[PDB]
Amino acid sequence: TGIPVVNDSTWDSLVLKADEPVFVDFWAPWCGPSKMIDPIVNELAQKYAGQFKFYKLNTDESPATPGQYGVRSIPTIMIFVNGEKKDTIIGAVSKDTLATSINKFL
Ligand code: NA
């Protein structure tokens, strides 16, 4: 069980057109550090429920969006507000690092 998925088909409607700030987790199953963040992304999604949307994009399954947005390594977190990219947090970082960035858009 984890956060909902976004893919290339739904990127515009779920991320760019969202009512709420959005946290996006770029990950892939070949990258173990990008999977090891799932418990703290899930903790964040529960804590921030109703203030942020949370989605994960599998760069193996949805290659167009990471290509377009210049993703070079995973995990990569991006935050969007009203259609605008507001932050990028690259690499397997602490929950506190992520909460700092999330709270900036609260
Ligand atoms: Na909340």
CA of 56 to the centre of ligand 1 (A): 19
Whether 4 is covered by a domain: the verdict is no
CA of 51 to the centre of ligand 1 (A): 5
CA of 50 to the centre of ligand 1 (A): 5
Token output for 93: 């970082």
CA of 26 to the centre of ligand 1 (A): 22
Whether 62 is covered by a domain: the verdict is yes
**What total of structural domains would you count in the chain?**
1
For the chain, give the longest Cα–Cα distance: 33
The DSSP-derived string for the chain is: --SPB--GGGIIIIIIT-SS-EEEEEE-TT-HHHHHTHHHHHHHHHHTBTTBEEEEEETTT--HHHHHTT--SSSEEEEEETTEEEEEEESS--HHHHHHHHHHT-
For residues 72 and 51, give the distance between their C-alpha atoms in angstroms, rounded to a whole number.
28
Whether 3 is covered by a domain: the verdict is no
Q: What range does the domain containing 36 cover?
A: 10-105
CA of 44 to the centre of ligand 1 (A): 9
Whether 65 is covered by a domain: the verdict is yes
CATH number at 23 reads: 3.40.30.10
Whether 2 is covered by a domain: the verdict is no
